[PDB]
Design a binder for this molecule. Structure first.
Ligand SMILES: CC/C=C/CCCCCCC[C@@H](O)CC(=O)N[C@H]1[C@@H](OP(=O)(O)O)O[C@H](CO[C@@H]2O[C@H](CO[C@]3(C(=O)O)C[C@@H](O)[C@@H](O)[C@@H]([C@H](O)CO)O3)[C@@H](OP(=O)(O)O)[C@H](OC(=O)C[C@@H](CCC/C=C/CCCCCC)OC(=O)CCCCCCCCCCCCC)[C@H]2NC(=O)C[C@@H](C/C=C/CCCCCCCC)OC(=O)CCCCCCCCCCC)[C@@H](O)[C@@H]1OC(=O)C[C@H](O)C/C=C/CCCCCCCC
Ligand SMILES: CC/C=C/CCCCCCC[C@@H](O)CC(=O)N[C@H]1[C@@H](OP(=O)(O)O)O[C@H](CO[C@@H]2O[C@H](CO[C@]3(C(=O)O)C[C@@H](O)[C@@H](O)[C@@H]([C@H](O)CO)O3)[C@@H](OP(=O)(O)O)[C@H](OC(=O)C[C@@H](CCC/C=C/CCCCCC)OC(=O)CCCCCCCCCCCCC)[C@H]2NC(=O)C[C@@H](C/C=C/CCCCCCCC)OC(=O)CCCCCCCCCCC)[C@@H](O)[C@@H]1OC(=O)C[C@H](O)C/C=C/CCCCCCCC
Ligand SMILES: CC/C=C/CCCCCCC[C@@H](O)CC(=O)N[C@H]1[C@@H](OP(=O)(O)O)O[C@H](CO[C@@H]2O[C@H](CO[C@]3(C(=O)O)C[C@@H](O)[C@@H](O)[C@@H]([C@H](O)CO)O3)[C@@H](OP(=O)(O)O)[C@H](OC(=O)C[C@@H](CCC/C=C/CCCCCC)OC(=O)CCCCCCCCCCCCC)[C@H]2NC(=O)C[C@@H](C/C=C\CCCCCCCC)OC(=O)CCCCCCCCCCC)[C@@H](O)[C@@H]1OC(=O)C[C@H](O)C/C=C/CCCCCCCC
Ligand SMILES: CCCCCCCCCCCCCCCC(=O)OC[C@H](COP(=O)(O)O)OC(=O)CCCCCCCCCCCCCCC
Ligand SMILES: CCCCCCCCCCCCCCCC(=O)OC[C@H](COP(=O)(O)O)OC(=O)CCCCCCCCCCCCCCC
Ligand SMILES: *C(=O)CCCCCCCCCCCCCCC
Ligand SMILES: *C(=O)CCCCCCCCCCCCCCC
Ligand SMILES: *C(=O)CCCCCCCCCCCCCCC
Ligand SMILES: *C(=O)CCCCCCCCCCCCCCC
Ligand SMILES: *C(=O)CCCCCCCCCCCCCCC
Ligand SMILES: *C(=O)CCCCCCCCCCCCCCC
Lengths: 523, 138, 138, 138, 138, 138, 138
């Protein structure tokens, strides 16, 4: 080595911070690092500009390289003002933390080089650009510059609801203040969702996030293979949200829902519920309007670890959510939904992938009253447990003789096999992802496939078998439903695609099946 | 219960063990007592911990609508008390020490109170690192 | 039960085995006893493990809304006691060693107490690495 | 069960076979026994393997509400014992060697105990590589 | 079962067939026997293989709750025995040789035991590659 | 059955037909027979084809719960034997040839044994590419 | 069906048309027959194709569990035989040619046997591209 210049106190530490072993040949990395262990440090001596540049005498005859490290130190310059122009929403506060020299401190260009870049990960700048006090040679600034509502239309097709539309306007900057306002609208066989939504991501300067949701879920049952009941429901929820980890979050809020239960196909499973609340209309005729207004408190949690957003095969994803009313509304209940996700890659080459998503739920009515039936859990279908028709798993209802009708001589509980759902849900599925063959091996690493063994068990936690002999006890703890098969998912300029074929191997009588299902657009 | 129990001259964290730290000497002037704050300003946890406990306490009084009002007044009162007691349980007794290094200077450093009772005029050693300094006696 | 058993001179991590690391010599002055903290500042696991067991101990008393109060008060008390007890299974005894190297210097290094008792005035060998140092006696 | 078994002077990983690695020579002093901790500090795999076995063991006493308390306290005690017992099946004997290379220098290296027993004064050959060194006798 | 059968001077991988190999000459000193390991630290596949087979044996004792406990205790015991057995079918006998090249140097290389028997002093013909070396006899 | 058949001097990959191959001439020394491995070290395909055929061979015995034990023990045993038998369907004979080019050097190259039988001292016409070498006898 | 059909001198791919190819001249010696293996290492298309067809041929025997046994043994034997036949329809005859360019050199190249018959001693018009060559006879 050699030192030629004023280091202000690193003159001897060259062989300790910037050392190599003699005999090592001319390197552009392990000799430049000798330059670059004192090129960044010197902003810890208040020195603003640490300059290290070393130009050896490249000697070839008997091959020694005599390094000559001209290090001249900077000087002690300070942090007066941080100035952003053109942007009416970005703050001088968060755009200080995402840089690494606070206001009122010894300042340097080279040790603010740890700050300028991360400011762009806000997701709203196109560029993130980067002063001695104007005409005064001691105090100094750090400055930046920034360069800164699109419709969207969705049309899909499918098996669970066939046709499917989306259309809504998003504008993630309300007049220059960072509020995220977004609208959405979806229509298909059973529900039509037309929602407005707002958010302020920084309620507190430190991260608290407040969203107020105005939704409307004009739903319908018969087209969705269930039994008969119609729902036009409107409600509004508001939730807080505060970051805690960047691997976590948390939320809490107050949620008011209002439902119009009507047009019910008389049947025991819901007619237990009507009594306990206090409504007993005619037991075989369908002109009845049960109205609920539920206020309900809600909360959640989250976790993210995946490395790649698109076609992810790493990390671990989690979710929790619960809910409970105050005991001062119409129906009183609570609800607990847990979610999981895990993409385990076994080696760096990343062709073997392991995935399995566990989900749990449970609900109950508190003071002896019952969970509303439209809030139950449904299992079986394409998106959760492939092979069995959508919703088809869940202890079936029992139609009354209504107008099972008295024209044919119906005078009892006509046993039915129609899916209704349930209140305790548990779905596991272990999936074992494998390479993509049969296409050119140049690009045979894209179109994903997997073999899967999906289970699903919803039951009525309060269903009776004292009173129903000829029927089984529909609360069996191990009435599992496994299935297997295949399916191919990928990207193409016509949206998200997948095609499937899954054989239902295990099931019980009364459990329908659906071997084949597809997805284009959205499901 | 934020753990600011590492801010004494008699406790070290895990991250600064088995590492080389310089030694500088000095004498001491002007010890005086001072309190130390440690934690956050939002106190996002004490608020919830006081809020649920003050909220469930509402469900004990009244009935009908009179209950559903007390179960919110109690909730915000518990919310206030949660921060009012969490951030008053992070106070710690401590000291503020002027020292004159033998190198010729004077510096100030502040520490949590421990067992030893310093004096104005004594020899104390500065186990120095990259901008963390602990003042042990002798 | 975070494992802070690597902080002595009598245990090595697996990432410091089968490696070349230099040796310097020195003598010892001023050994004094010190406690060593470790691990997390938040104790997010002790909080959960305390909250659950504190909640399930609230279900055992009362009936109705008198129970539903206890099943939350117990939860908060268990949540606090969790952090309270977890940050008590990290207190580990240790020592603070000041040593004069033969090059002519002085440094000070802190290290978990083991079996051997260092003495005021002795010879120790400094096993050095990329800014990691362990002190072996003899 | 972590396998810190390749840290011996007697077993090589399959990534270090059929390779060219240099040979240096040296004499040896200062042999002392030291333990080796291998694996991760958090040690999460044994936490589940203790929590579940201590949770199902909680379903064996009492009934009603008194069974939930038991099968949660047993769960957290099982988790604690799990982390406590896994990190105590990685402890492995080892040696500290202070070798003088015939160049004229000194380095120390730590290495899992095998079968051969080093001595105070012996000739060893350093199978050296990019900072991985195995010390064999003779 | 890792197929660590390719570490012989008598079995080549298909990655290095029909490829050009430099040749050097040398003599040999100090043959000695050494075990060779391979694979991963964790042995995932053996873990699950142990866990499931040790779970389905758990079901076959008792009933009610005592079955539900044993089917988990057997599960974790089989899981441990997995890693305990998988890492036992990679232990392969082998040798470690240092050889004196006719250039005038010394290197040492480690190989699987084969049919050939080496001696201390023999004209072994190196095959070299991009840092892969085999030692053939005579 | 990973296609390790193109490692002879009598079969070419389609990737190197209609390309330019340099010609060198040389004489030959010390032909010796060797085996060649090819494919994977983990043998994933044999694992499935052993696992399913060991599973469905379990179902043929017992009933109740002892059925559910054999129908997994058979699966794991088949999984082991799968990797066991796949990596024995790739052991193929071969030769190792040291050859002296007219340049004045020596190299050795390894090939799959075909039908023609080399001799100790002959003439072979090297075909060279981007580090691929073949040996034809004449 | 792997398309190794563009390996003749009488067939060109759609990428090597309407592009300029340099022309050189030469004489010819040492023509000998060779087999060309063209396609993938895995044969992962006829492997499934044989697997499915070998499966459905399993349901057609036995009854009950003895059926469900055969409906898998047929699969892997059907699966394995799939590769064994697909790799038997990628074998193609071809020739090896030692051409002397009039530049004064020698190179060799192999091709799929076409309709023309090369001979030892003739004139050929080497067509060249970005390291791609064909040998038309005349
Ligand atoms: C080594 C080998 C492997 C390990 C295990 C192998 C086992 C092998 C053999 C097994 C034989 C088995 O048959 C035993 C059995 O379970 N036998 C039991 C079994 O029969 P089977 O055999 O199954 O057929 O079941 C029966 C069910 O019993 C009861 O069921 C009721 C409802 O069910 C009933 C009904 O309404 O009556 C009856 C039933 O027939 C059916 O009809 C149901 C129906 O389902 C719905 O109604 O209804 C519940 O009332 P509810 O629902 O309305 O609420 C009731 O809850 C109740 O009774 C509520 C109780 C609650 C007591 C709270 C204790 C917590 C201490 C923490 C404080 C410290 C603060 C920091 O409250 C009371 O009872 C009030 C009494 C006043 C005084 C009590 C003490 C107050 C505080 C003490 C502090 C002490 C300080 C020194 C519940 N008690 C109960 O189910 C039982 C309850 C009673 C208390 C026992 C004393 C334990 C003291 C230890 C603490 C030391 C403190 C320093 O036992 C328990 O909560 C166990 C809880 C252990 C939790 C872990 C400890 C955590 C803390 C330790 C410190 C680290 C029991 O009688 C049998 O027990 C009995 O025949 C009595 C006999 O003794 C057995 C009891 C076992 C407990 C041992 C645990 C100790 C070590 C822990 C090990 C991990
Ligand atoms: C070359 C070889 C190739 C093989 C195939 C080729 C040809 C074969 C084809 C046709 C022949 C065959 O069909 C014969 C047959 O199946 N015959 C059977 C067939 O009838 P059919 O043919 O259809 O007419 O099925 C019927 C089923 O029988 C019983 O049915 C009960 C329920 O049935 C009932 C009811 O009452 O509820 C009534 C019934 O009528 C019906 O209604 C059903 C209803 O459907 C639902 O309930 O219910 C179950 O009780 P449950 O519900 O509560 O569970 C019970 O399982 C039970 O009760 C629970 C059982 C299970 C315990 C297993 C644990 C042992 C640990 C081993 C480790 C050693 C040391 C640690 O436990 C017991 O039964 C207690 C026995 C103790 C001894 C166990 C062996 C251990 C020995 C070592 C000990 C250490 C000391 C040295 C079950 N027993 C049973 O189903 C059988 C059970 C009995 C134990 C066998 C003893 C010797 C085995 C030697 C093996 C290793 C030893 C070194 O065995 C088994 O489950 C299989 C055991 C597999 C072990 C594999 C180990 C892993 C290997 C990995 C290698 C690396 C039996 O009648 C026939 O067997 C009998 O009439 C009695 C007979 O004697 C036993 C049967 C033979 C099994 C052995 C073969 C396995 C080898 C491995 C295969 C890959
Ligand atoms: C080399 C050899 C190779 C082996 C090959 C062979 C393998 C297979 C062959 C087939 C034979 C086998 O089938 C035998 C059998 O299972 N036979 C059983 C089978 O019959 P069949 O198969 O049909 O023929 O099933 C029958 C049903 O069993 C019973 O079912 C009841 C419910 O049934 C009922 C009801 O009342 O609700 C009525 C019934 O009629 C029916 O209708 C059912 C119906 O299904 C639902 O309604 O309902 C349960 O009550 P519940 O629902 O309310 O819970 C009850 O469990 C109960 O009640 C609850 C139990 C609690 C037991 C658990 C605690 C053990 C401690 C271990 C760790 C130490 C802690 C630090 O409590 C009791 O049983 C009360 C006993 C009081 C005294 C306890 C003393 C133990 C203390 C030890 C302390 C040591 C300290 C150092 C349960 N007992 C039972 O199931 C039995 C229970 C007996 C109590 C303990 C004795 C031995 C303990 C050894 C521990 C060593 C300690 C160092 O045994 C067991 O739960 C198995 C326990 C497994 C433990 C695994 C290890 C876990 C910990 C790991 C530690 C490292 C039993 O009669 C038969 O039992 C019996 O024949 C019992 C007999 O007497 C002796 C059996 C010994 C077991 C040895 C196995 C161990 C190896 C483990 C492998 C991983
Ligand atoms: C690391 C600290 C984590 C602390 C979490 C403790 C979990 C508490 C679970 C209590 C369950 C009681 C509710 C139902 C009671 C009942 O009688 O339930 C009865 C039913 C089964 O009995 P039936 O046969 O009568 O249905 O359920 C059970 O017995 C469920 C099994 C309980 C044992 C599971 C072990 C504890 C949690 C698992 C590990 C999670 C750790 C995750 C860490 C990352
Ligand atoms: C290595 C750490 C893994 C720890 C995992 C512990 C899980 C404990 C599961 C106990 C099962 C009892 C639940 C209900 C009992 C019952 O009567 O359940 C009833 C039903 C079936 O019984 P019937 O046939 O009588 O209906 O289900 C079962 O019996 C479930 C089968 C259990 C055996 C599988 C063994 C564990 C699964 C695979 C292991 C995963 C390892 C992960 C490695 C990282
Ligand atoms: C460390 O301290 C973690 C924070 C835990 C929060 C502590 C909350 C204290 C509870 C006070 C409740 C006062 C109730 C008053 C209602 C009128
Ligand atoms: C390693 O030391 C961390 C262990 C993980 C947390 C376990 C802490 C135990 C919690 C005890 C809860 C006591 C409840 C008291 C009720 C009043
Ligand atoms: C490598 O050894 C990994 C093993 C991980 C689990 C080891 C077994 C620990 C479980 C012990 C649980 C005891 C609970 C007792 C409660 C009273
Ligand atoms: C190569 O070896 C691949 C791994 C094959 C699995 C081997 C693991 C064997 C599992 C044995 C389980 C024994 C359970 C004993 C319980 C007491
Ligand atoms: C190329 O060779 C791929 C081959 C795919 C695997 C075929 C191997 C057959 C596996 C036989 C399993 C034996 C069953 C034993 C049952 C006890
Ligand atoms: C291009 O050629 C595509 C691949 C062709 C696949 C043909 C599969 C042949 C299957 C023959 C079946 C024999 C099975 C006999 C088992 C007893």
């Amino acid at each position: 080595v050699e030192v030629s210049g004023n280091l202000a106190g690193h003159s001897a530490e060259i062989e300790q911070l910037t050392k190599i072993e003699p005999g090592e040949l001319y390197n552009g990395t392990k000799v430049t690092k000798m330059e670059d262990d004192i090129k960044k440090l010197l902003g810890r001596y208040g020195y603003a500009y640490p300059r290290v540049q070393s130009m050896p005498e490249i000697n070839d005859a008997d091959k020694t390289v005599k390094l000559r490290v001209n290090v001249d130190a900077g000087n002690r310059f300070y942090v007066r003002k941080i100035r952003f122009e053109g942007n009416d929403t970005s703050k001088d506060a968060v755009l200080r933390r995402e840089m690494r020299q606070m206001e009122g401190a010894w300042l340097g260009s080279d040790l603010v080089d740890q700050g300028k870049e991360r400011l762009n990960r806000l997701g709203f700048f196109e560029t993130v650009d980067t002063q001695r006090v104007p005409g005064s040679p001691d105090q100094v600034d750090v400055v930046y510059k920034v360069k800164e509502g699109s419709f969207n239309f969705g049309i899909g097709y499918g098996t669970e609801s066939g046709v499917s539309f989306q259309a809504g306007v998003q504008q993630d900057n309300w007049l220059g203040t960072g509020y995220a306002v977004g609208i959405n609208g979806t229509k298909n066989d059973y529900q039509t969702y037309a929602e407005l939504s707002v958010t302020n991501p920084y309620f507190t300067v430190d991260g608290v996030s407040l969203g107020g949701r105005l939704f409307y879920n004009d739903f319908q049952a018969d087209d969705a293979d269930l039994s008969d009941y119609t729902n036009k429901s409107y409600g509004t929820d508001v939730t807080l949200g505060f970051p805690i980890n960047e691997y976590n979050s948390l939320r809490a809020g107050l949620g008011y829902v209002h439902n119009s239960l009507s047009n019910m196909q008389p049947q025991v499973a819901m007619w237990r519920y009507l009594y306990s609340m206090g409504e007993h209309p005619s037991t075989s005729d369908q002109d009845n309007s049960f109205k609920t207004d539920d206020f309900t408190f809600n909360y959640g949690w989250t976790y993210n670890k995946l490395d790649r957003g698109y076609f992810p095969t790493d990390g671990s994803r989690v979710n929790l959510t619960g809910k409970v009313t105050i005991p001062g509304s119409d129906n009183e209940y609570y609800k607990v939904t847990l979610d999981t996700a895990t993409y385990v890659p076994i080696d760096d080459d990343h062709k073997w992938v392991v995935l399995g998503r566990t989900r749990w739920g449970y609900g109950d009515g508190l003071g002896g009253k019952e969970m509303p039936f439209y809030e139950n859990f449904y299992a079986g279908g394409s998106s959760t447990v492939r092979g069995f028709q959508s919703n088809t798993i869940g202890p079936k209802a029992v139609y009354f003789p209504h107008q099972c009708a008295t024209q044919d001589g119906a005078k009892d509980l006509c046993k039915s096999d129609d899916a209704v759902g349930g209140n305790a849900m548990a779905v596991a599925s272990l999936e074992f992802i494998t390479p993509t063959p049969f296409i050119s091996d140049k690009y045979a690493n894209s179109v994903r496939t997997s073999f899967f063994w999906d289970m699903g068990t919803v039951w009525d936690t309060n269903w009776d078998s004292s009173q129903y002999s000829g029927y089984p006890d529909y609360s069996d703890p191990s009435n599992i439903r496994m299935s297997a098969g295949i399916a191919l998912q990928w990207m193409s300029p016509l949206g998200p695609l997948v095609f499937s074929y899954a054989q239902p191997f295990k099931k019980y009588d009364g459990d329908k099946a659906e071997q084949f299902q597809f997805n284009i657009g959205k499901t | 219960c934020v753990n600011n129990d590492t801010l004494s001259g008699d406790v070290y964290t895990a991250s600064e063990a088995k590492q080389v730290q310089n030694v500088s000497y000095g004498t001491i002037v002007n010890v005086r007592p001072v309190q130390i704050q440690g934690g956050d300003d939002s106190n996002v946890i004490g608020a919830i911990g006081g809020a649920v406990l003050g909220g469930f306490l509402g469900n004990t009084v009244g009935g009908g609508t009179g209950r559903s009002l007390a179960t919110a007044a109690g909730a915000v009162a518990g919310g206030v008390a949660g921060q009012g007691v969490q951030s008053a349980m992070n106070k710690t007794q401590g000291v503020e020490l002027e020292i004159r290094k033998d190198d010729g200077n004077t510096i100030m450093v502040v520490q949590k109170q421990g067992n030893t009772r310093f004096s104005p005029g004594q020899r104390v050693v500065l186990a120095s690192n990259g901008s963390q300094v602990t003042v042990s006696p002798r």
